């Protein structure tokens, strides 16, 4: 939150999360309603950058097997 | 506007230059209205202009970025 | 007389090749059989049955008892063909069944026909009959009897298959004969013994001969090409080069006396180079006044795909240094034991695209980049230095370069400072590395190799693909794979010890042992794929061009040559860059005028000044859009260069949708 300017959201979530102490339907619906507030959109980018972001990475073998 | 966001790679394919992180390859947010010509039957609404896609099919540098 | 050779023999084509002087037999009475169809017939034969039944059946077949098959439609179309226009019904038929066939408008309602047709068998009329359940042994054993054999199925092996009905119902000797399958049925049939079972390039003839020599080795009448040359007496393709092996030995003549140290062999040198270098069975000094190899033994070792000895059979990598644990200084050539052809064009080379050759760190580059630059067989250049990219160049356009970047890796290891102390810490007195310490160095080497070198290599190789089609050296296998290199990937090695090369050369710009450590880093950075013997590239590079001038030579320079390249229309405001260059005889370039060079499109950026004293040129950049060029689109008969820069014959220039244009005279 401090990197992106959302500390007023993150601290607001943490201080409200710290008030539930029993496991019933209330604290469960809190989790449901908190998960609902994420934004479900479909990320759009060109295929010519989809390939050259996804298909250019490579694994790194720190301990290879010897010759 | 979008002139400082994209460029043309070697092998003449369009890319973008990223400003924050190497995964900044999505659609940026810029002013859009300067690349528009209005529809008939209603003045207020425009679409992508045909001259820019004509020059992009011809092989202009800026017109391919704009389309 | 019938002898067998380890190559596919057709009567009309292998006479034009000659094919028997190619094994080393001086030579009418030699009639060639057509064993072209039996190899494809064997390939169709092997997928259904096992191996051993098929091979052990084909072994017991003589190739003088001339015969043929017969293939017939199974039962319903067999009776329907006899119902049809020909009454060509044989006399083996049932007296009632032919009577019911000679009538008109038979149908399902005829009980008297159907009752007899449901009890009728093909094996009643035709005998002997090959059904689909018969063994392959009994097919050939029944074939060797009576000059025609009736079948039911296609999957048979042996002679030619001819059909009985039209397709609407289906679903000459001499004295000496050669072939490609050793027969056993005659007490006298022979097999040649020139080449062993390890150098046979068909992969079905090899599979056949291993199984023949596995079990029938005592009963084969075996002969040598010299005895064949005794018994006989008393278009022109490229990429087919005869090869032999050099049986030499190293001798140590100190003063007066000579000794013999090793007994080596050099497996697949081409014969044309041995003829043009003019070497014989004599002694040779292979060192100069310095101690460098004297420019022809170097080329001989760079053409071969191996060098081992004969007492043991391990790989022998020779010493390039002059330090004497084992210096090879004198060579005595003692013979040439096998001789066969080889298809020089490899499998991986399919589309015309740049060549990435992976050599190790201490391989001889400074000599071969001198030698390959100075070769010219015709009015072209085979491989100039301006078309070759070093492994060094990819990591030099950087804030302090990759060798100097990993030179200061020592800051970060406990107890390590002043790089000589690191090099003393890793290597022992043997200069063989310790097992952990080299990996502890590698776990800091590896992110510098991947996160820092590979994007710059990807950018550089895109740039090198743009400005022509070149040849790029590379240190390791993964260096061309983590960076998305486009081109043919070639894994190569030389027959030399690359390690002791790294102590001969001074002016190494750093620690002289540090570069040996850096060589070990690249040797462990690569994947575990087997390299493929630098002669496998060098024969492709030299030997088609040298064979070309023996038949293209002095026809005319105007109409033996032609060139492929990109063509821009003349209507421009202020053009033919070349792509490859082809030299061939007259009929081949006349066959190259067709096969249209459209369906190939680029985007040529053409803007530069004049650079050199040659005429008006602009170093353009072409980027191929469509598919790349196949080689069978060119030919098998016409040699062509592999690398080329881009230039055309002031003003400016922009993106031009170019096309190709075959020009000639």
| B27 part of contact set with chain C, CB < 8 Å | no
Distance CA C577, CA C596 (A): 18
Backbone angles phi, psi at C438, to 5 degrees: -65, -35
Distance CA C501, CA C575 (A): 47
Tokens standing for C68? 């043929």
Mutate: best of C604, C655, C657, partner B, most B CBs <10 A: C655
| C240 part of contact set with chain A, CB < 8 Å | no
Distance CA C656, CA C132 (A): 63
Distance CA C3, CA C516 (A): 55
Closest CA to C59 of C115, C136, C112, C130: C136
Burial bucket for residue C257 (CB in 10 Å: 0-12, 13-18, 19+): exposed
Of A43, A45, A48, the CB nearest to B13: A48
Answer for the pair C316, C308: CB distance below 8 angstroms, yes or no.
Answer: yes
Answer for the pair C252, C293: CB distance below 8 angstroms, yes or no.
Answer: no
Residue C469 is given by DSSP the state B
Mutate: best of A51, A59, A62, A65, partner C, most C CBs <10 A: A62
- Give long-range contacts, CB 8 A cutoff, 24+ apart: B11-20: B11/C462, B11/C465, B11/C466, B11/C623, B12/C603, B12/C605, B12/C623, B12/C655, B13/A48, B14/A48, B14/B64, B14/B65, B15/A48, B15/A49, B15/A52, B16/A49
Answer for the pair C357, C473: CB distance below 8 angstroms, yes or no.
Answer: yes
Closest CA to C274 of C250, C252, C245: C245
Question: C319: which residues sit within 8 A by CB, 6+ positions away?
Answer: C325, C326, C327, C328, C497, C500
Query: By CA distance, what is A44's nearest residue in B?
Result: B26
Backbone angles phi, psi at C452, to 5 degrees: -125, -35
Distance CA B16, CA B29 (A): 13
- Rama region for A44: left / alpha / beta (φ>0; ψ in -120 to 50; rest): beta
Backbone angles phi, psi at C437, to 5 degrees: -65, -35
Separation in Å, CA of A44 to nearest CA in chain B: 7
| B17 part of contact set with chain C, CB < 8 Å | no
Distance CA C170, CA C151 (A): 13
Answer for the pair C501, C362: CB distance below 8 angstroms, yes or no.
Answer: yes
Separation in Å, CA of A47 to nearest CA in chain C: 17
Distance CA C17, CA C15 (A): 5
Answer for the pair C30, C174: CB distance below 8 angstroms, yes or no.
Answer: yes
Query: By CA distance, what is B26's nearest residue in A?
Result: A45
> Which method was it determined by?
cryo-EM
Answer for the pair C589, C582: CB distance below 8 angstroms, yes or no.
Answer: yes
Distance CA C27, CA C15 (A): 12
Q: State the residue for tokens 């010890």.
A: C497
H-state helical runs in C255-395: 271-277, 297-303, 368-371
Question: C423: which residues sit within 8 A by CB, 6+ positions away?
Answer: C511, C513, C514, C517
Answer for the pair C543, C276: CB distance below 8 angstroms, yes or no.
Answer: no
Other Cβ atoms less than 10 A from the Cβ of C574: the count is: 7
Residues of B in contact with A55 (CB under 8 A): none
End-to-end CA distance of chain B: 14
- Rama region for C386: left / alpha / beta (φ>0; ψ in -120 to 50; rest): alpha
Closest CA to C503 of C362, C380, C628: C362
Residues of B in contact with A43 (CB under 8 A): 26
Strands (DSSP E) found in C435-585: 471-474, 488-491, 561-564, 566-567, 580-583
Q: Is C462 helix (H, G, I), strand (E, B) or coil?
A: helix
Peptide bond into C300 cis (omega under 30): no
Which residues are bridge partners to C250 per DSSP? C262, C331
Backbone angles phi, psi at B12, to 5 degrees: 60, 50
Which residues are bridge partners to B47 per DSSP? B37
Residue C595 is given by DSSP the state S
Task: Look at strands B46-48 and C2-4 and give their pairing.
Answer: unpaired
**Interchain CB distance below 8 Å, C462 and B59:** no
Dihedral sign from CA coordinates of C91, C93, C96, C99: negative
Residues of C in contact with A60 (CB under 8 A): 446-447, 450
Distance CA A45, CA C147 (A): 72
To the nearest 10 degrees (0 to 180), the angle between helices C514-525 and C435-448 is: 80
- For residue C50, the Cα-to-chain-centroid distance in whole angstroms is 28
Return the exposure string of C440-464: e unless at least 16 CB atoms fall within 10 Å of the residue's CB, then b. Answer: ebbeebbeebbeebbebbbebbbeb
Dihedral sign from CA coordinates of C156, C158, C164, C166: positive
Distance CA C642, CA C541 (A): 9
Tokens standing for C48? 């259904």
Residues of A in contact with B25 (CB under 8 A): 45, 49, 53
Query: By CA distance, what is C481's nearest residue in A?
Result: A58
Closest CA to C457 of C501, C397, C502: C397
**Interchain CB distance below 8 Å, A45 and B13:** no
Residues of C in contact with A57 (CB under 8 A): none
Q: In three state form, how does the secondary structure of C513-543 look?
A: CHHHHHHHHHHHHCCCCCCCCCHHHHHHHHH
C-alpha to C-alpha distances, C343 to B20, C207, C533, nearest whole angstrom: 54, 19, 16
Q: State the residue for tokens 């098998």.
A: C636
Which of 6-25 (B) contact A at CB < 8 A? 13-16, 23, 25
Backbone angles phi, psi at C387, to 5 degrees: -110, 5
Burial bucket for residue A33 (CB in 10 Å: 0-12, 13-18, 19+): exposed
Mutate: best of B26, B28, B64, B65, partner A, most A CBs <10 A: B26
Answer for the pair C408, C499: CB distance below 8 angstroms, yes or no.
Answer: no
**Interchain CB distance below 8 Å, B27 and A44:** yes
Query: By CA distance, what is C478's nearest residue in A?
Result: A58
Distance CA C470, CA C448 (A): 27
| A57 part of contact set with chain C, CB < 8 Å | no
| C317 part of contact set with chain A, CB < 8 Å | no
Residue C151 is given by DSSP the state E
- Rama region for B41: left / alpha / beta (φ>0; ψ in -120 to 50; rest): left
Tokens standing for C142? 């029944």
Q: State the residue for tokens 């014959």.
A: C649
Return the exposure string of A42-65: e unless at least 16 CB atoms fall within 10 Å of the residue's CB, then b. Answer: eeeeeeeeeebeeeeeeeeeeeee
| A66 part of contact set with chain C, CB < 8 Å | yes
Q: Is C383 helix (H, G, I), strand (E, B) or coil?
A: coil
- In sequence order, what DSSP letters do the residues of C205-253 get, joined into one string? HHHHHHHHHHHSTTS--EE-HHHHHHHHH----SSEEEEEEE-EEEEEE
Dihedral sign from CA coordinates of C479, C481, C484, C487: positive
Answer for the pair C553, C520: CB distance below 8 angstroms, yes or no.
Answer: no
- Give long-range contacts, CB 8 A cutoff, 24+ apart: C566-572: C566/C602, C566/C604, C566/C622, C566/C658, C566/C659, C566/C660, C566/C661, C567/C658, C567/C659, C567/C660, C567/C661, C568/C604, C568/C606, C568/C648, C568/C656, C568/C658, C572/C653, C572/C656
Closest CA to C143 of C67, C42, C41, C34: C67
Dihedral sign from CA coordinates of C53, C55, C60, C63: positive
Tokens standing for C222? 């075996």
| A53 part of contact set with chain B, CB < 8 Å | yes
C-alpha to C-alpha distances, B65 to A43, A52, B1, B61, C93, nearest whole angstrom: 20, 18, 12, 7, 83
Burial bucket for residue C614 (CB in 10 Å: 0-12, 13-18, 19+): exposed
Answer for the pair C149, C69: CB distance below 8 angstroms, yes or no.
Answer: yes
Of A45, A52, A53, the CB nearest to B27: A45
Answer for the pair C233, C74: CB distance below 8 angstroms, yes or no.
Answer: no
- Helix, strand, coil share of chain A (percent; to 5): 45, 0, 55
State the Cα angle at C61 between C60 and C66, rounded to 5°: 165
Question: C453: which residues sit within 8 A by CB, 6+ positions away?
Answer: C394, C395, C402, C479
Task: Look at strands C355-358 and C471-474 and give their pairing.
Answer: parallel
| C482 part of contact set with chain A, CB < 8 Å | yes
State the Cα angle at C292 between C289 and C295, rounded to 5°: 100
Other Cβ atoms less than 10 A from the Cβ of C22: the count is: 18
Question: C569: which residues sit within 8 A by CB, 6+ positions away?
Answer: none
Residues of B in contact with C623 (CB under 8 A): 11-12
H or E stretch at A61: none
Task: Look at strands C340-343 and C240-246 and give their pairing.
Answer: antiparallel
| A60 part of contact set with chain B, CB < 8 Å | no
Distance CA C645, CA C620 (A): 9
- In sequence order, what DSSP letters do the residues of A3-18 get, joined into one string? TTT-HHHHHHHHHHHT
Task: Look at strands C69-71 and B6-8 and give their pairing.
Answer: unpaired
Q: Is C309 helix (H, G, I), strand (E, B) or coil?
A: strand
**Interchain CB distance below 8 Å, A67 and C523:** yes
Distance CA C367, CA C292 (A): 10
Distance CA C174, CA C30 (A): 7
- Those chains having 3 or more beta-carbon pairs within 8 angstroms of chain C are A, B
Tokens standing for C180? 């490609």
Of C443, C523, C528, the CB nearest to A65: C528
**Interchain CB distance below 8 Å, B15 and A48:** yes
| A41 part of contact set with chain C, CB < 8 Å | no
Answer for the pair C72, C122: CB distance below 8 angstroms, yes or no.
Answer: yes
Answer for the pair C116, C100: CB distance below 8 angstroms, yes or no.
Answer: yes
Tokens standing for C14? 């292998």
**Interchain CB distance below 8 Å, B15 and A52:** yes
Q: Please, how many CA atoms are within 13 Å of residue C205, restricted to the half-sphere of its CB?
A: 23
Answer for the pair C284, C277: CB distance below 8 angstroms, yes or no.
Answer: no
Burial bucket for residue C90 (CB in 10 Å: 0-12, 13-18, 19+): exposed
Answer for the pair C265, C245: CB distance below 8 angstroms, yes or no.
Answer: yes
Distance CA C4, CA C2 (A): 7
H or E stretch at C640: strand C639-640
**Interchain CB distance below 8 Å, C655 and B10:** no
Question: C14: which residues sit within 8 A by CB, 6+ positions away?
Answer: C7, C8, C32
Which of 25-54 (B) contact A at CB < 8 A? 25-27
Tokens standing for C188? 């006298």
Distance CA C317, CA C500 (A): 11
Q: Is C507 helix (H, G, I), strand (E, B) or coil?
A: coil
Count A/B contacts: CB-CB distance under 8 Å: 15
| C626 part of contact set with chain A, CB < 8 Å | no
| C450 part of contact set with chain A, CB < 8 Å | yes
Task: Look at strands C639-640 and C580-583 and give their pairing.
Answer: antiparallel
Question: C171: which residues sit within 8 A by CB, 6+ positions away?
Answer: C73
Other Cβ atoms less than 10 A from the Cβ of C641: the count is: 20
| C446 part of contact set with chain A, CB < 8 Å | yes
Residue A65 is given by DSSP the state P
**Interchain CB distance below 8 Å, B16 and A43:** no
Total H helices, total E strands in chain A: 3, 0
Of C446, C454, C458, the CB nearest to A62: C446
State the Cα angle at C580 between C574 and C585, rounded to 5°: 125
Distance CA C383, CA C426 (A): 40
């Amino acid at each position: 939150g401090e990197k992106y300017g959302l500390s007023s959201v993150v601290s607001e979530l943490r201080r409200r999360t710290k008030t539930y102490s029993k496991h019933d339907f209330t604290s469960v619906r809190y989790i449901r309603d908190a998960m609902a507030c994420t934004s479900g959109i479909f990320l759009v980018r060109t295929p010519t950058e989809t390939v050259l972001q996804e298909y250019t990475q490579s694994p790194e073998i720190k301990v290879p097997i010897p010759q | 506007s979008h002139d400082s966001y994209y460029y043309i790679d070697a092998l003449n394919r369009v890319r973008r230059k990223t400003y924050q992180g190497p995964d900044d390859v999505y659609v940026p947010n810029c002013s859009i209205v300067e690349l528009l010509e209005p529809h008939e039957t209603l003045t207020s609404y425009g679409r992508l202009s045909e001259a820019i896609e004509n020059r992009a099919k011809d092989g202009d540098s800026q017109a391919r970025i704009a389309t | 007389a019938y002898i067998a050779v380890p190559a596919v023999v057709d009567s009309r084509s292998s006479e034009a090749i000659g094919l028997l002087e190619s094994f080393g037999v001086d030579a009418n009475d030699v009639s060639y059989q057509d064993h072209d169809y039996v190899v494809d017939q064997l390939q169709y034969m092997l997928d259904g049955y096992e191996a051993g039944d098929v091979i052990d059946a084909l072994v017991y077949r003589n190739w003088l008892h001339h015969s043929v098959y017969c293939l017939l439609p199974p039962k319903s179309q067999l009776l329907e063909y006899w119902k049809s226009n020909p009454s060509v019904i044989p006399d083996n038929v049932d007296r009632r069944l032919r009577k019911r066939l000679m009538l008109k408008k038979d149908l399902r309602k005829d009980d008297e026909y159907n009752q007899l047709a449901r009890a009728f068998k093909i094996s009643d009329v035709y005998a002997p009959l090959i059904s689909s359940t018969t063994s392959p042994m009994t097919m050939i054993q029944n074939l060797n009897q009576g000059e025609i054999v009736y079948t039911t199925t296609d999957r048979v092996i042996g002679a030619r298959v001819l059909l009985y009905a039209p397709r609407k119902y289906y679903a000459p000797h001499s004295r000496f004969n050669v072939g490609t399958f050793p027969s056993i049925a005659t007490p006298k049939c022979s097999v040649m013994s020139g080449v062993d079972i390890e150098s046979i390039p068909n992969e079905f003839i090899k599979l056949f001969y291993q199984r023949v020599k596995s079990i029938h080795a005592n009963i084969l009448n075996d002969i040598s090409p010299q005895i064949v040359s005794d018994m006989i007496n008393r278009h022109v393709d490229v990429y087919r080069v005869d090869v032999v092996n050099v049986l030499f030995e190293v001798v140590d003549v100190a003063d007066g006396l000579r000794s013999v140290s090793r007994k080596l062999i050099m497996h697949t040198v081409p014969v044309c180079i041995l003829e043009l270098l003019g070497i014989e069975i004599a002694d040779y000094c292979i060192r100069q006044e310095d101690g460098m190899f004297t420019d022809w033994f170097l080329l001989l070792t760079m053409l071969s795909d191996g060098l081992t000895d004969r007492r043991t059979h391990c790989q022998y990598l020779i010493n390039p240094s002059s330090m004497p644990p084992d210096v090879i200084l004198n060579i005595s050539i003692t013979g040439f034991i096998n001789r066969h052809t080889i298809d020089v064009m490899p499998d991986v080379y399919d589309f015309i695209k740049p060549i990435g050759a992976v050599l190790p760190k201490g391989s001889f580059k400074s000599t071969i980049m001198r030698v390959l630059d100075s070769i010219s067989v015709l009015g072209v250049k085979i491989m100039p230095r301006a078309h070759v990219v070093d492994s060094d160049e990819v990591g030099e356009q950087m804030e302090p370069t990759f060798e100097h970047a990993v030179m200061e890796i020592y800051k970060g290891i406990a107890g390590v400072d002043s790089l000589d102390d690191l090099t003393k810490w890793v290597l022992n007195s043997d200069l063989v590395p310790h097992d952990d310490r080299l990996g502890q160095l590698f776990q800091a080497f590896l992110p510098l190799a991947k996160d820092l070198l590979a994007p710059m290599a990807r950018q550089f190789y895109d740039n090198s693909m743009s400005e022509g089609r070149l040849l790029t050296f590379a240190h390791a296998d993964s260096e061309l794979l983590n960076a998305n290199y486009f081109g043919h990937l070639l894994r190569l090695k030389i027959p030399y010890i690359t390690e002791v090369n790294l102590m001969i050369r001074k002016n190494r710009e750093g620690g002289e042992l540090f570069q040996l450590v850096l060589s070990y880093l690249y040797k462990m950075y690569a994947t575990s794929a087997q390299p493929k013997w630098f002669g496998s590239l060098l024969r492709l590079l030299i030997c088609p061009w040298l064979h070309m001038e023996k038949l293209i030579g002095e026809a005319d320079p105007a109409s033996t040559s032609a060139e492929i390249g990109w063509h821009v229309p003349r209507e421009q405001l202020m053009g033919f860059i070349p792509y490859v260059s082809i030299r061939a005889p007259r009929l081949v370039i006349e066959e190259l005028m067709e096969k249209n060079w459209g369906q190939y499109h680029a985007q040529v950026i053409v803007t530069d000044q004049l650079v050199v004293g040659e005429p008006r040129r602009v170093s353009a950049k072409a980027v191929i859009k469509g598919n790349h060029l196949p080689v069978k689109l060119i030919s098998r008969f016409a040699c062509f260069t592999l690398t080329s820069k881009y230039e055309m014959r002031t003003g400016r220039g922009a993106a031009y949708n170019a096309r190709l244009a075959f020009r000639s005279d």
